[PDB]
Design a protein around this ligand. Structure first.
Ligand code: CA
Ligand code: CA
Ligand code: CA
Ligand code: CA
Ligand code: CL
Ligand code: NA
Ligand code: ZN
Ligand code: ZN
Length: 415
């Protein structure tokens, strides 16, 4: 149905359907069954690149491009900047250079087109297929087509032209789709903060064109792996009955439809949150989650961020200015007491009085023996405190002040 079309378009489906569906589920990290479960269908409905997921190089490293026409969605200058900046991402990590040409036939011709546009791959109206591009070669080789039926933006709203152009131009240069959800070359549209090459993208492009001569040696964000025993966390919170773990740009949480873990961008839920969260907790009575970075914090109700945030922590919680960031936090459901961990110390805040309890830079070591003097992340579940510090997870009883178990940080995951 949807399944048959998707597999035909993207998995070269000419039961052969069952095998193609398994291949699709493998690609997207779904449970490989060959059957169309609700998550599989969710993925199939995601806006994405029109290039298939299943099956060279420009000879020269100096390439030209031409923007044949411009979407009325944005000023021409924003279109030029979005495309220029996309070429720049790839040229930053290779010897490739790109020159914009204003007439004639370039290596890479860029256009905005609707439906049928004369190359055997028609677009499909708003959503679905957002764009496609052709592998290196003569004629239409290199060319990138954007579906004009999309609403193109220059910000976080769907769909950011710069983000999609960086992906399309990857194809133009010889790349194919990645299974890494952190990569620009992932098939489905994603957006998180500033568009950048993941390490997977850098590795893939350099394996075709080589490294740049820049003494830096540009690096990109690596995508966390749930079953990597070296996995550590930025922050963790309970949220409406489940536990969400945060690392860099991503959240992880258990999910029956994914064998190890559901891993996706934080921006799927909360685009306005900054990159690199430091702590998070739920205030259950207000149906609210709060995220901390530096001296600022953001409040959130389900998938929506509240107004007026960020707010600073000094005015809101009454920390002294000496506190420059918080390391971890949890709010205990039946008390309204929030514990904020800051290096080797902790504070207790009363949410209903909206002030710190008396007596409160206390030492973590005095009241939480055995977990060490620093906390990466913490949450509460069934009255226990689950402290994370590096690769180590402590299940700590606040009643007896004892460490029950000590496991890997990734132990909640089906590994
Ligand atoms: Ca479309
Ligand atoms: Ca061309
Ligand atoms: Ca448009
Ligand atoms: Ca932290
Ligand atoms: Cl935390
Ligand atoms: Na927390
Ligand atoms: Zn693509
Ligand atoms: Zn086309």
């Amino acid at each position: 149905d949807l399944v048959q079309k998707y597999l035909e378009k993207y998995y070269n489906l000419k039961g052969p359907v069952v095998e193609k569906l398994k291949q699709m589920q493998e690609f997207f990290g779904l449970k490989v069954t060959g059957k169309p479960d609700a998550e599989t269908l969710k993925v199939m409905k995601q806006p994405r690149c029109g290039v298939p997921d299943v099956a060279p190089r420009w000879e020269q490293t100096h390439l030209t491009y031409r923007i044949e026409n411009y979407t009325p969605d944005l000023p021409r200058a924003d279109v030029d900047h979005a495309i220029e900046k996309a070429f720049q991402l790839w040229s930053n990590v290779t010897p490739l250079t790109f020159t914009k040409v204003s007439e004639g036939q370039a290596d890479i011709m860029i256009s905005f087109v609707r439906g049928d546009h004369r190359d055997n791959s028609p677009f499909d109206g708003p959503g679905g297929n957002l764009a496609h591009a052709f592998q290196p070669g003569p004629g239409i080789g290199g060319d990138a087509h954007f579906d004009e039926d999309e609403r193109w933006t220059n910000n976080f709203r769907e769909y950011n032209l710069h983000r999609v152009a960086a992906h399309e131009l990857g194809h133009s240069l010889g790349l194919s789709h990645s299974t890494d959800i952190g990569a620009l070359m992932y098939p489905s549209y994603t957006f998180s903060g500033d568009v950048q090459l993941a390490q997977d993208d850098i590795d893939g492009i350099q394996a075709i064109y080589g490294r740049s001569q820049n003494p830096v040696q540009p690096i990109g964000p690596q995508t966390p792996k749930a079953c990597d025993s070296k996995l550590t966390f930025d922050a963790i919170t309970t949220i409406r009955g489940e536990v969400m773990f945060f690392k860099d740009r991503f959240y992880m949480r258990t999910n029956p439809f994914y064998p190890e873990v559901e891993l996706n961008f934080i921006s799927v839920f909360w685009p306005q949150l900054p990159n690199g969260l430091e702590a998070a907790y739920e205030f259950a009575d207000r149906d609210e989650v709060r995220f901390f970075k530096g001296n600022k914090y953001w409040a959130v109700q389900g998938q929506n961020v509240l107004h007026g945030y960020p707010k600073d922590i000094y005015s809101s919680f009454g920390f002294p200015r000496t506190v420059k960031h918080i390391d971890a936090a949890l709010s205990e459901e039946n008390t309204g007491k929030t514990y904020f961990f800051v290096a080797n110390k902790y504070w207790r805040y009363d949410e209903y009085k909206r002030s710190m309890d008396p007596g409160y830079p206390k030492m973590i070591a005095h009241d939480f023996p055995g977990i060490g003097h620093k906390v990466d992340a913490v949450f509460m579940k069934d009255g226990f405190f689950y402290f994370f510090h590096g690769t180590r997870q402590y299940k700590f009883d606040p009643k007896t002040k004892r460490i029950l178990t000590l496991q890997k940080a990734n132990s909640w995951f089906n590994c």
